[PDB]
Amino acid sequence: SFLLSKVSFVIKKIRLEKGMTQEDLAYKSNLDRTYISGIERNSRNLTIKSLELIMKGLEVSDVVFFEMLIKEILKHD
Amino acid sequence: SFLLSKVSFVIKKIRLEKGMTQEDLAYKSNLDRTYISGIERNSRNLTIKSLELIMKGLEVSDVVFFEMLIKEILKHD
């Protein structure tokens, strides 16, 4: 769905804005690198707990993450 | 965390706003009643796909759901 694609898009977009590799985000989020690469391809099985770990590894607040997601849905769906 | 608890809270609040039982939401969302009850107690392991199923069963937009979650975090965290 658009939602599942854009959860993945927003993760990747923030990661790269911050100059972080997948390897860096894995370390900071406490999730292994293959998990990160998978959820950036398809977010279907990403859990709320893992998403919170990823937001902490990205050093973005949940509010800001969710607001970027909403903007992506409004402007592109 | 506050986020995991408020995901649970917002699901449940919208459910009651729509006048639905857990069994009603289970049938509409394609997730069984023990999964619904469980995620309303603790959203840790709720997935993005299951959250989309639940939003469809609640007949609420993803944008409305995430805006209600942002409002709860801003005002109460």
Numbering used by the authors:
A (entry chain B), B (entry chain A): 3 to 79
Report text from the authors:
The most widespread of these mechanisms employs a “controller” (C) protein encoded by a gene downstream of its own promoter, and usually co-transcribed with the endonuclease (R) gene as a single transcriptional unit.
Since the resolution of the diffraction data from each mutant protein (1.5–2.0 Å) was significantly better than the previously determined native structure (2.7 Å), we also crystallized the native protein and obtained crystals that diffracted to much higher resolution (1.4 Å) than the published structure, to permit a more accurate comparison. One obvious feature of the higher resolution structures was the presence of several water molecules on the surface of the proteins. In terms of crystal contacts, Y29 does not stack with a symmetry related Y29 residue in the manner observed in several C.Esp1396I crystal structures. A large number of crystal contacts occur through the C-terminal tail of C.Esp1396I and symmetry related chains. The other primary intermolecular interface is centred on one of the SO4 ions. The wild type structure of C.Esp1396I presented in this study revealed further details including an additional, third conformation of the flexible loop region that was subsequently observed in several of the mutant protein structures.
